[PDB]
Design a protein around this ligand. Structure first.
Ligand code: MTA
Ligand code: MTA
Lengths: 285, 274
């Protein structure tokens, strides 16, 4: 997996291209009940978590994805108090969500407790999320878990890997209907929604399906060097027909941005995140 | 190229690399100026590489080519005389000549063999060279710039500090320029110093960026400078209708994308503004 001092990420979901990162030190590699877990210290990106050969995060750039997937839904809800995170093993999304004063309770449903233990050791700037008194930590498959909940959450975030391995269930279309049922009457959701330069077919499919369930459906994206093609997007759905995802109902002041130690997200970034290249705008609209 | 893959490494982006899977090597020769490599990739179509750095792929060249031309052109009320420096593949030329306002495009390219390789292996880009608006010039664009004064409405540097002053002199009184401008995820300190340098020469300086999978870190920026102190780079002075975007066959650029392109991640906004 590491060859001549480099880790190369290949996957059928982005054929013919690969990011490599230069390795200073192998830190972990063990198989859990669910997936292969590899952690290494990279030369230029800090520590790197890899699950079944796909890069999950690096300490250098994790902040863009973590801040965006949390703040896109939270700042699009006028009063989000109860939050569900599915996945989120590294704790980074949790870290971001709990910064919001309005959030009282964060339930996290993670399938693989080994990812949590590895992240507490090797991703300390992300796994700081686990020290929050707002956390209820839950174990199991998010798909089956979702069934347990009705009219319960203001915001659901699905912080998953790609549609392979244990995350495959989180990309079933019934999962979106399960989240709709789980959400309160005016709830919102934000899911890792893949890359517009790689997966436009899937993005257009997800969007058409969600449009038949929700009065408001949007796609936003962030840049992040160490995901395939250097960016990834977010499927956003609201049960509230008045939700305008493009214009944050909770705009953050610069004071809040500073206090929240944000390195990527702010209110204009939020707005611009919905402005897609013409080829993607055309295909989705 | 090793074991069916081309891997791009460079000390300007240490410890990271894009590899592209190779279907067929097409061309590999050293010109008088640089090493020229062209291959058919498995998934990005043909790929041009100069001294081991990826210049373009047929799959995603449209993003950078559309942005570097339209950012300055749509930020000028009537750009008639245009100068492109570099631009060997022809693709920026292809985008500039779409504008009816443009009467002449001078292109100054140092390496005539890039032009010949691009006409063979990058036909979607080298189509630019069929324009009647073209005046093709040969040589170093730096020394070339010294030849011109008060001549161009728009200068685009499509490249593989004193140069910026030369461009200022070459531009007309209200001229604008756009240069390839560094990745904000790789060299934010350099964007900062270049911006400060440019602010000492020009009344209006901005930084914009586009996404493009096959440049380092998946994006690249643009330095924009204007001699017109009223220029607003962020809000295009020539907005495009949907009809126009359709007619120009744009696949990345439109007027909203233009505006969004100046909205930077907080770390970069902070470093360039605060
Ligand atoms: C690293 S953040 C992504 C996380 O999603 C977790 N995950 C994958 N599949 C599921 C699932 N079906 N339910 C809950 N969490 C999951 C993975 O174990 C990983 O920690
Ligand atoms: C491929 S587009 C970039 C182009 O810039 C050209 N180039 C590099 N250096 C110079 C220079 N000093 N003057 C003009 N063109 C240049 C390269 O030869 C290439 O064709």
């Amino acid at each position: 997996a590491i060859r001549e001092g480099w880790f190369r990420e290949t996957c059928s979901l982005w054929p013919g291209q690969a990011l490599s990162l230069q390795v200073e030190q192998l830190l972990h590699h063990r198989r859990s009940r669910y997936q292969d877990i590899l952690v290494f210290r990279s030369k230029t990106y800090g520590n790197v978590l890899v699950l079944d050969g796909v890069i999950q995060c690096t300490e250098r750039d994790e902040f863009s994805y973590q801040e965006m997937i949390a703040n896109l839904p939270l700042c699009s809800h006028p009063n989000p108090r109860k939050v569900l995170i599915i996945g989120g093993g590294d704790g980074g999304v949790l870290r971001e969500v709990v910064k919001h004063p309005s959030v009282e309770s964060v339930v996290q449903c993670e399938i693989d407790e080994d990812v949590i233990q590895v992240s507490k050791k090797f991703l300390p700037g992300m796994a700081i999320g686990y020290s929050s008194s707002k956390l209820t930590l839950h174990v199991g498959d998010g798909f089956e878990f979702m069934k347990q909940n009705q009219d319960a959450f203001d915001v659901i975030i699905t912080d998953s890997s790609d549609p392979m391995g244990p995350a495959e269930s989180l990309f079933k279309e019934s999962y979106y209907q399960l989240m709709k049922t789980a959400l309160k009457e005016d709830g919102v959701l934000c899911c890792q929604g893949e890359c517009q330069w790689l997966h436009l077919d899937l993005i257009k499919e997800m969007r058409q399906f969600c449009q038949s369930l929700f009065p408001v459906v949007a796609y936003a994206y962030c840049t992040i060097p160490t995901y395939p093609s250097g960016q990834i997007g977010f499927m956003l759905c609201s049960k509230n027909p008045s939700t305008n995802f493009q214009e944050p109902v909770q705009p953050l002041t610069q004071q809040q941005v500073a206090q929240m130690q944000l390195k990527y997200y702010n209110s204009d970034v939020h707005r611009a995140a919905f402005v897609l290249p013409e080829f993607a705008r055309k295909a989705l609209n």
